[PDB]
Design a protein around this ligand. Structure first.
Ligand SMILES: Nc1ncnc2c1ncn2[C@@H]1O[C@H](COP(=O)(O)OP(=O)(O)OP(=O)(O)O)[C@@H](O)[C@H]1O
Ligand SMILES: [Mg+2]
Lengths: 213, 96, 327, 310
């Protein structure tokens, strides 16, 4: 539980696209070299009130949250404490960070998970189950659905070099974990693209938040 | 041009070809190669005697490739035969 | 018959460099070529004087709104600013910035920024850092020319606090032995190793018989600073350096807390570091006045200070002062 | 395919003439010389000269352009990584206006080809300045080969010993940069091939042999190239050209380029009159003069006799 920490920063600035994974990751790596080589690090989605043009308006509860092992914080704290970064032509500022624990919950949820070479929902469930066994985890797999009930896919736009690649993923809800296995899931996660702002798992209330709108 | 001396003057031929070819309206600003050739107030280009003949030739080459005329007419071309060396006829024709 | 039908269409290769893509000598080592020496080498490779090549190609990209042909017949100072000039062009000044940008655009090379100190702009104070007049080590030039090696001027020679060549233990010579005058770094034609005024030779077996140990820390620290910049792989972050200095200050404070006597040895540096951490962090720090003595008393090389991460730096500091902390 | 694109008939005359002019055929001699030249280019084997002879119109210029283009596309995958890396350089020698060949013009034209900045201004760090600039440009730009077309104009000197001193200057240029020099020219180049040991060792000689009428294989090859030229002639009806093979050989001496330009003339004449077939008198209108053919035959016979050394 407390053996892993979620670094939270009060984030303020211009409104941000809702598929801003690579943008914020690249900006952070620009203002933090060691972030580009760490392994067990991941970033929580940035909350807020969205807009009509697929952009998110940052609010008071909007904050940049980073999942990290407690034995690697001193490699990231110098480059982010009070620091500011630019996403394109927009200015973003981070305050003094605060530490939040990894709490267990009965059910978990992930906004976007991607595993290479899996586009259909059924094989995605099978692959998430395979990674699920690889971690010694027990639970049941469900996919978050749209208003239509269709499983909801989310897309990440990595704008590497001149080109840009498309990676599509699903929202995965897993329940009945038992708190120890729940903590293992939130800390490991599924998908691997945790630096890419996808694989972090969260308690199940945010799943309802995303399913309402 | 029939030359006063025993040798055909290629410098005079090159500069006369350049001045004859370059007589359009002033709007064309080609900016020929070599520093010694340029326009003037009256529109007629001027070439100083300091300019060496091969540089004038290269400027003529650039002007010809830019303008790209269909045919270059030379009247009384037998004037190319005024030389002193016997083999120099082949040299003149090779230059042309 | 023959079914082979050749096609002679052009291939349209990517645009070539306007100037030759000359590699910079000893990049990442304490003997990196200065930007001035690189300019003179590029001019020599093109069979043009540095001045003439400058207004031929660099001036139109630097001087935005002038007639380039009319720029071809001027003095180098109109765009370089010889009112300043000095070996300080190798520093982090604005004309150095635009010159480096133009040079990197002309040759599409990606290492000329390491031949100067613009990577340390906002980090190291400009004043009291570079010599006003050109300097050289005659032994270095003589050895290089005898060994058929490329002549150049290292960045270290441009600093006031670097007066000796550690390879030859020879004091730097600022005056031409033939004409008796002191060369400016920038000139109409100043090939490396040659007297820019009298065209005389500047490489001789001059012996250095001074107390080089006094300046050894300074010269080695500056050499490490030059050699480390290309190896970082990124533009340094000012607050990274500021917080490394603050960490060294905290280590000093803990060491003083453990041992009172160390206050006598470190009080002035403690006050200087505290002032540097209380003034605006974006303000640059005086290299030889502050950072080099600070890492010296911390028993830490400049390379270790600017290269290692916060974990390694903290661990090495704690081990150096025998503290029990663990970051 | 043996036939030209069939939609070209509906297209205007200019389009048909263009399709004919950028079309070229590969006859066995041309492809064999191409393979030999590129094999020598890939592996110079310590030879700095690849002198190529040939009759006027065997296809020396076309082979030069083809080799340039193919080496350019072979090098293309790596020019994005490495700049200032011009793959090949090909320039043509200039006959001198004066009695003697001019080398300042040669050096400045070579510099112009390499896109050298500030050529006229220059300086000498010591035409020596132009020569040093060319040497440095060749060293740094790193060209794979250096074609010098019309190499017969090199020996436009009244001194018999300076004839090889021209190649001595070229050789001194070559050694300090180590760049291959493959000169191309007519049979007049034969007086430069192996003079002195320096030009006798590091020079590889390639002869662009024409199609002589003695060997039946060469006659069959000439008939085949006539057939493919007929089948690739953009006309409404295909004229029979193989029958007058003797007439076509008489005014072309076996030079494929001569046949190509003659057929281009005839095709343009037909297109201007909107004709649908080629008549014998159409070829007779634009045929070369008998005296001209006699002169070029004498020249190529002398060249073949000189090159017949075994
Ligand atoms: N094999 C060929 N197939 C088609 N056209 C050819 C061929 N060989 C040469 N040509 C034509 O000949 C012309 C090029 O000149 P060519 O190479 O024949 O002359 P050359 O006398 O060998 O060269 P140069 O006079 O420049 O030394 C072009 O019109 C080209 O289309
Ligand atoms: Mg030709």
């Amino acid at each position: 539980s407390e053996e892993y920490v979620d670094l939270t920063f009060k984030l303020r600035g211009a409104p941000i696209p809702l598929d801003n994974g690579y943008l914020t990751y690249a900006a952070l790596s620009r203002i933090c070299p060691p972030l580009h080589e760490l392994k067990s690090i991941g970033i929580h989605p940035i909350a807020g009130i969205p807009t009509r043009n697929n952009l998110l308006e940052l609010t008071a509860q909007s904050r940049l949250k980073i999942r990290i092992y407690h034995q690697q914080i001193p490699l990231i704290y110098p480059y982010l404490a009070g620091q500011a970064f630019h996403i394109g032509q927009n200015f973003y500022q981070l305050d003094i960070p605060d530490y939040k624990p990894l709490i267990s919950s009965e059910s978990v949820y992930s906004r976007l998970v991607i595993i290479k070479g899996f586009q259909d929902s059924t094989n995605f469930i099978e692959a998430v189950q395979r990674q699920m066994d690889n971690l010694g985890i027990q639970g049941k797999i469900e996919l978050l659905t749209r208003q239509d009930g269709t499983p909801q896919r989310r897309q990440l736009t990595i704008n590497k070099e001149g080109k840009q690649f498309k990676v599509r993923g699903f929202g995965v809800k897993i329940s009945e974990l038992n708190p120890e296995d729940s903590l293992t899931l939130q800390e490991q996660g599924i998908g691997g693209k945790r630096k890419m702002m996808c694989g972090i798992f969260v308690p199940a209330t945010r799943s309802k938040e995303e399913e309402e709108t | 041009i029939a030359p006063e001396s025993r040798y055909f003057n290629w410098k005079e031929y090159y500069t006369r070809a350049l001045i004859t070819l370059e007589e359009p309206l002033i709007d064309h600003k080609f900016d020929y190669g070599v520093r010694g050739i340029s326009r003037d107030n009256f529109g007629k280009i001027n070439v100083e005697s300091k300019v060496v003949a091969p540089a004038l030739r290269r400027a003529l080459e650039n002007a010809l490739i830019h303008r790209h005329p269909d045919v270059f007419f030379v009247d009384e071309a037998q004037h190319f035969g005024k030389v002193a060396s016997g083999y120099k006829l082949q040299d003149q024709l090779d230059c042309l | 018959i023959y079914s082979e039908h050749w096609s002679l269409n052009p291939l349209e290769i990517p645009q070539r460099s306007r100037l030759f893509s000359l590699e910079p000598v000893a990049v990442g080592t304490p003997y990196a070529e200065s930007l001035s020496s690189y300019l003179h080498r590029l001019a020599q490779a093109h069979c043009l004087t540095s001045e003439k090549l400058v207004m031929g190609e660099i001036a139109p990209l630097i001087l935005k709104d002038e007639d380039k042909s009319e720029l071809l017949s001027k003095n180098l100072s109109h765009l370089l600013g010889n009112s300043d000039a000095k070996p300080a062009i190798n520093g982090m000044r604005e004309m150095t910035e635009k010159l480096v940008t133009v040079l990197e655009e002309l040759t599409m090379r990606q290492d000329l920024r390491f031949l100067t100190l613009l990577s340390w702009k906002g980090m190291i104070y400009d004043k009291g850092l570079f010599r006003n007049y050109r300097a050289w080590c005659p032994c270095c030039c003589e050895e290089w020319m005898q060994k058929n090696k490329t002549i150049y001027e290292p960045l270290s020679w441009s600093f006031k606090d670097v007066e000796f060549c550690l390879i030859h233990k020879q004091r730097l010579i600022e005056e031409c032995s033939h004409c008796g005058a002191r060369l400016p770094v920038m000139a109409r034609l100043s090939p490396a190793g040659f007297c820019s005024r009298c065209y005389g030779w500047l490489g001789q077996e001059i012996k250095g018989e001074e107390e080089i140990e006094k300046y050894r820390v300074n010269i080695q620290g500056i050499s490490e600073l030059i050699a480390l910049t290309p190896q970082l792989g990124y533009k340094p972050i000012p607050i990274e350096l500021t917080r490394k200095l603050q960490l060294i200050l905290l280590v000093f404070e803990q060491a003083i807390g453990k041992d009172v006597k160390l206050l006598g040895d470190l009080g002035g540096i403690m006050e200087s570091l505290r002032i540097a951490s209380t003034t605006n962090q974006s303000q640059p720090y005086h290299l030889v006045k502050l950072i080099i003595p600070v890492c010296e008393k911390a028993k830490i090389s400049v390379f270790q200070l600017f290269g290692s991460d916060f974990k390694e730096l903290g661990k090495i500091l704690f081990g150096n002062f025998s503290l029990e902390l663990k970051l | 395919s043996t036939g030209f694109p069939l939609e070209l008939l509906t297209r205007p005359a200019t389009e048909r003439l263009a399709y004919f002019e950028n079309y070229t055929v590969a006859h066995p001699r041309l492809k064999e010389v191409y393979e030999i030249l590129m094999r020598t280019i890939a592996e110079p084997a310590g030879a700095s000269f690849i002198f190529v002879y040939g009759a006027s119109g065997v296809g020396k210029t076309t082979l030069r352009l083809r080799v340039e283009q193919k080496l350019t596309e072979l090098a293309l995958p790596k020019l994005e990584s490495d700049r200032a890396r011009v793959p090949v350089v090909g320039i043509e020698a200039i006959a001198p206006e004066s009695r003697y060949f001019n080398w300042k013009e040669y050096y400045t034209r070579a510099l112009i080809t390499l896109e050298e900045p500030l050529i006229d201004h220059k300086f000498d760090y010591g035409a020596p300045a132009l020569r040093r600039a060319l040497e440095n440009a060749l060293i740094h730009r790193h060209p794979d080969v250096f074609f010098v077309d019309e190499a017969q104009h090199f020996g436009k000197v009244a001194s018999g010993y300076k004839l090889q001193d021209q190649l001595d200057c070229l050789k001194s240029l070559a050694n300090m940069t180590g760049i291959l020099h493959c000169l191309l020219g007519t049979y007049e180049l034969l007086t430069f091939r192996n003079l002195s040991g320096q030009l006798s060792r590091r020079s590889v000689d390639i002869h662009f042999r024409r199609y002589c009428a003695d060997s039946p294989e060469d006659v069959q090859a000439f008939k085949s190239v006539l057939l493919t030229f007929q089948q690739h002639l953009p006309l409404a009806e295909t004229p029979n050209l193989v029958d007058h093979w003797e007439y076509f050989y008489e005014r072309t001496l076996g030079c494929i380029g001569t046949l190509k330009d003659w057929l281009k003339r005839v095709l343009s004449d037909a297109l201007d009159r909107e004709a649908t077939t080629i008549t014998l008198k159409d070829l007779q209108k634009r045929a070369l003069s008998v005296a001209q053919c006699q002169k070029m035959f004498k020249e190529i016979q002398e060249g073949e006799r000189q090159l017949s050394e075994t």
